[PDB]
Structures are given as C-alpha cells and as structure tokens.
Amino acid sequence: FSGNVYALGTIGYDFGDEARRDTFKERMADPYDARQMVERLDRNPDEARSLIWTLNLEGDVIYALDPKGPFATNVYEIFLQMLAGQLEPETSADFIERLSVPARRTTRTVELFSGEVVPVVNVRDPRGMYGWNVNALVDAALATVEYEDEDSLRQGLTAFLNRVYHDLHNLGQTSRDRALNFTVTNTFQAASTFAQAIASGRQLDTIEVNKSPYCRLNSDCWDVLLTFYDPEHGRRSRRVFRFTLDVVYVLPVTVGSIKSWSL
Amino acid sequence: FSGNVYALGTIGYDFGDEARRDTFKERMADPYDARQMVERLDRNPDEARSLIWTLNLEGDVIYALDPKGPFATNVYEIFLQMLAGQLEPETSADFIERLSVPARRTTRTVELFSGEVVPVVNVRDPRGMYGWNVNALVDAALATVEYEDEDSLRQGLTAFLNRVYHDLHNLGQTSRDRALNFTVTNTFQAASTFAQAIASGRQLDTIEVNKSPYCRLNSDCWDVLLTFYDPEHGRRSRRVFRFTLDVVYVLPVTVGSIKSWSL
Ligand SMILES: [Zn+2]
Ligand SMILES: [Zn+2]
C-alpha cells in the first residue's frame, strides 16, 4: 500500500508504442478518431487491455489507469463508457464532461507514445467512479425549488458548479488534495442543496477546508465550509453549508448530513 | 522598491477600529450597508481616506490598498466606482464582478477590525485598473462572429472566460503569478479573438505558460499558450493562441499581437 489517489479529469487512451498503434491501424480507418475506437472496443472488449488508459486534467496526463483484480473487465467497461460519453453531443443524456476516479497508488510508471513517463494507479472496481455533465446536475437542482427566473437560476447554478470544479481540482494525492477533489464530487451530488441559496439571490463567496474534529481517531476527516452571500442587497445574512469528508478510504465517504445555517 | 503586485478580486472597505466605525455610524443608518457607504462617499469624497480599502480574492483579504502620490484622489474615485459597480444589478451596464489592480509592494501592514494583519500595497494612479462583467465581455465577443446558436455560443464563451479566471487567479506577487493574473486580464480584453474558436465548436483544453525568449534582456516575459479542441468530432485540428506578456513593469504590457495557428 503506497497511499490513495482521488482524481478528476478526462479519460483517454494511448498506444504506448508504434507496434500497438499499428495493431489498431489495421482494425479501423483511423485509431486516433476516438469515435472509431469506442466502436471497435465496444465490439471487441478484450482489445481494451492492449491500450494505456490515461486520466488527464486540462491537458496534463497525470495518471495511467491500471485495472487489476477480479473486476478488471468491469473497470474496462466503465473506462469505455466514460470515453464514449465524452464524445457525445453536449445535449445528450449520456454526455460526460466531469469525471471522478478513486485509485490505489503504486510505484510503477509507464512510458506514453510521446515519451512522457506517468505514474500508474490501480483502479480495482467501478465503485466511486462517476461521470457527470453540468446541465444534468443543474436540471436536478432546479427540480427542488420554486420559480418562474429559470434562465437566471440555471446560469447561476451552472456558474457555481463550474467555479467549484476549477477552484479545487488538483492532482489528488495528499489528504488535503483528495479532500478538495472529493468536495467537487460531493458538491455535484448535492447540487440541489445549494439551489435555494442561489435562487434566493446569493452566490458562493468562500470555500474553506479544515481538518475535522468530528471523526474517530485514525480517520482522515476534513470539514468543508461553503458560504454564500448577496453582493447586491444591503445587510443580508450569509448562508453557510458544511459537510465532513473522510478520505482515509480509497472510496472517500461523507460523514453525516450536510449542515446549513445563517450568519 | 520591494517589487510589484498584480492582483485580481473584490474591492471592499474596513473600519480598522471602533472609533472609525462610530464616525460612520453617525453618518448613515447602517455603514455596513455598502449601498449606503457608496452614497455617503459619493457625496463626501474626502471621507474615503478614513477607511481601509481592501482587495479580496474569494473571501481572503489579500491586500490593503493605499493610494499615494499626487493621484491619490483619482485612485479613491476608482475605488468607489468599483465598490459601486459590484453592488449593481447583474443586468446593469455598470455591473462589476471582475477586478484588476496593479500595485507596488511595501513593507507596511495594517490591522483590520477583525484583528487580521494584511500587507499594504501602493496604488499610484488609475492606469491598468479594470472592472468587468462577464456578460458584457461575451456581448463584445459575439459582435465579431457570424451565427444564428447564439444561446449556445453565449454559454460557451461565458464558461471559457469563467474557467480562465478560476484556473489562474492567484496572490499576484511572484513573476509567474503576476503573469497568470495578467493572462486573465488579457483574455478578457481579447475575448473576441477566441470567439471564432468557440463558435467553430471548440473549447479550451490547455493553458501553458512559459518564460519567453522573445523579449529584450532585463524584461520579465512569459509566453502563454491557450489550445482549443473539439472533443466531439473525430480528428480535428487544435487551435493555438499565443501571446507574450511582460510583467517587469508595475503596469504589465502585452508584447506584439496575439498569434494563432492550427496543430
Ligand atoms: Zn480548471
Ligand atoms: Zn475562483
């Protein structure tokens, strides 16, 4: 055990070398066309093992993803599902533009076709691997609040979810870094919780992350505070949301319910 | 000379102590209502000198702003203009949600009412101090391209400009950090340049910032590369934008025109 990783980004594939590239050049017109590769791998699942699967954060290849154990086949299936979803029209229910990947660290690295050497992490099974698109999260959020305003509320929720992602996304190795990446996951999953806040005419002000006093010993718990405010209307109370995250586990967990109160 | 600062964020004010707070409690119903303070200071400009003016990045008070020199009055006027714009309805032409502040470092600090001690920076005159709102930038961008699609293009441009801000915003002290903050400024100002890219169905992939070989000695130049790609449609060329920024000056400058080419 070399520690855990909790990473966000973009899934991709890499041929590693020219021999593997050539193998796939014979199997479709253009193996660099990911649409064609998705089709090929969907028809021939075992060929997925012949690629290097990568996690990419805003153009930086940060990890190679190695499925191992009895659920490797299951994991390859999710890899393909995520690859395919990224290629969908932005209006598709299966569209994917956000991704979470929990993994175990190793001391293994792999060389990409480019010559770059990236660290390998073990993805043992599909649990905790999520793919989202922002529009779908916003629609879920809108369903829980009363209004028209919808266009304004939709754009406010969109801007909130995107801000949280870009403010926090990171390499996902240290405890704090895993906590910040998992904060994004938790914010996405609990999007509707913040909808009344945005609908009330508030917007995110601060994100604060502290080591939590609320967990058992030998946990790795962090308290995350999101505070919302209204810049336009005088003295108005600030709304705080708190949740507690335990990242000691390779599958991080939320501890208790999301708390909220005014200041 | 202790170096330069190039900072982004939110302008605010602070009373420093209870005596100064009380002075303003007698001058309006509620001095914590920034709307009331804007009104008071617009009618009584010299009272602005009695406040601590702050720059705030996502809830962290990062600097106290000290206007000095023969243009201090001019600078206080801009402070007020920025404070007022932040309070406008989001639909107002004068709405402000993004801010750039160039300044000279000092070795002076000031204590805020809360007891926090923050570094003071000197803002000598209004040059290079910009206030934007994203919607207005997007409207400018849309004016230069052909379409309908507008709703889709508007949201794509919005997401781009917001991503760049949250990806890059920082404390703004080191050369690299000033370069990244100024990249945001330059991206905003040159928003229309990226509009064809987004209209073509591409989106930002990577931001890369390197020390530039294209400037004179004793400059502090950085090359910024923004690469755009289309995740949906097969093999399609990537579009690169490059510009060169010199942050040696307290007012950073762009060097040459923005370059663009395909890969
Ligand atoms: Zn980002
Ligand atoms: Zn941000």
HEC sequence for chain B: CCCEEEEECEEEEECCCHHHHHHHHCCCCCCCCHHHHHHHHHHCHHHHHHCEEEEEECCEEEEEEEECCCCHHHHHHHHHHHHHHHCCCCCCCCCCCEEEEEEEEEEEEEECCCCCEEEEEEECCCCCCEEECHHHHHHHHHCCCCCCCHHHHHHHHHHHHHHHHHHHCCCCCCHHHHHHHHHHHHHHHCHHHHHHHHHCCCEEEEEEEEECCCCCCCCCEEEEEEEEECCCCCCCCCEEEEEEEECCCCCCEEEEEEEEEEC
Contacts of B141 (CB under 8 A, 6+ apart): B157, B191, B192, B194, B195
* Partner A, chain B 74-133, Cβ-Cβ below 8 Å: 86-90
* Residues in chain B within 8 Å Cβ distance of A30: 234-235
Contacts of B229 (CB under 8 A, 6+ apart): B202, B203, B205, B236, B238, B239
User: CB distance from B150 to chain A under 8 Å?
Assistant: no
By C-alpha distance, the chain A residue nearest B170 is A167
Relative to beta strand B117-123, strand B60-67 is parallel
Relative to beta strand A52-57, strand A10-14 is antiparallel
Find, among A169, A174, A197, A196, the residue nearest to A185 by Cα. A169
Q: From CA A243, how far away is CA A141, in angstroms rounded? A: 18
Q: Are A205 and A142 part of one and the same domain? A: yes
Q: Are A4 and A90 part of one and the same domain? A: yes
CB within 8 Å: B162 and A167: no
Which pair of structure tokens corresponds to residue B189? 């100002």
Measured in angstroms, the CA of A86 and the nearest CA of chain B are apart by 7
Q: Are B107 and B148 part of one and the same domain? A: no
Half-sphere exposure of A184 (CA within 13 A, CB side): 29
Q: Are B17 and B68 part of one and the same domain? A: yes
Backbone phi and psi for residue A35, each to the nearest 5 degrees, phi listed first: -60, -45
The Å distance, Cα A51 to ligand 1 centre, comes to: 27
CB within 8 Å: A227 and B59: yes
Residues present in chain A in total: 263
Measured in angstroms, the CA of A51 and the nearest CA of chain B are apart by 19
Which experimental method was this entry solved with? X-ray
CB within 8 Å: A162 and B167: no
Q: Are A128 and A176 part of one and the same domain? A: no
Measured in angstroms, the CA of B84 and the nearest CA of chain A are apart by 10
Secondary structure (3-state) at A77: helix
Measured in angstroms, the CA of A229 and the nearest CA of chain B are apart by 11
Q: Are B162 and B247 part of one and the same domain? A: yes
Beta-carbon contacts below 8 Å between A and B:
65
Q: Are A39 and A91 part of one and the same domain? A: yes
For the CA of A163, the nearest ligand: 2
Ramachandran quadrant class, A183 (left: phi over 0; alpha: psi -120 to 50; beta: rest): alpha
B134-142 helix and B150-168 helix, angle to the nearest 10 degrees: 130
Q: Are B193 and B72 part of one and the same domain? A: no
Residue at which a domain ends, from A133, A148, A180: A133
Q: Are B89 and B208 part of one and the same domain? A: no
Residue at which a domain ends, from B115, B133, B151: B133
User: Is-contact A202 A229, C-beta < 8 A?
Assistant: yes
Q: From CA B144, how far away is CA B193, in angstroms rounded? A: 9
The Å distance, Cα B1 to ligand 1 centre, comes to: 34
Strand boundaries in A81-220, DSSP class E: 98-111, 117-123, 130-132, 203-211
Q: From CA B106, how far away is CA B123, in angstroms rounded? A: 11
Domains in chain B: how many in total? 2
Where b means 16+ CB within 10 Å and e means fewer, B150-173 reads: eeebbbbbbbbbbbbbbbbbbbbb
The Å distance, Cα B171 to ligand 2 centre, comes to: 12
CB within 8 Å: A206 and B86: no
User: CB distance from B35 to chain A under 8 Å?
Assistant: yes
Residue at which a domain ends, from A105, A133, A161: A133
Which pair of structure tokens corresponds to residue B225? 């590369």
Interface test with B, best of A87, A137, A166, A207 (most B CBs within 10 A): A166
For the CA of A164, the nearest ligand: 2
> Residue B1 to residues A8, B69, B100, B119: CA-CA distances in angstroms?
42, 15, 21, 15
CB within 8 Å: A163 and B162: yes
Which DSSP state fits A220?
-
Q: Are B129 and B163 part of one and the same domain? A: no
Q: Are B20 and B67 part of one and the same domain? A: yes
Q: Name residue A31's amino acid.
A: P
Resolution in A: 1.7
Q: Is B233 annotated as a binding residue?
A: no
> Residue A134 to residues A97, A161, A184, B129: CA-CA distances in angstroms?
8, 7, 12, 33
Measured in angstroms, the CA of B142 and the nearest CA of chain A are apart by 18
By C-alpha distance, the chain A residue nearest B89 is A232
Range of the domain at A84: 1-133
Q: Are B141 and B100 part of one and the same domain? A: no
If you search the block for the tokens 């400024």, which residue do you land on? B185
By C-alpha distance, the chain A residue nearest B151 is A151
Which pair of structure tokens corresponds to residue A171? 């390499």
Contacts of B195 (CB under 8 A, 6+ apart): B141, B142, B144, B145, B153, B157
Half-sphere exposure of B98 (CA within 13 A, CB side): 22
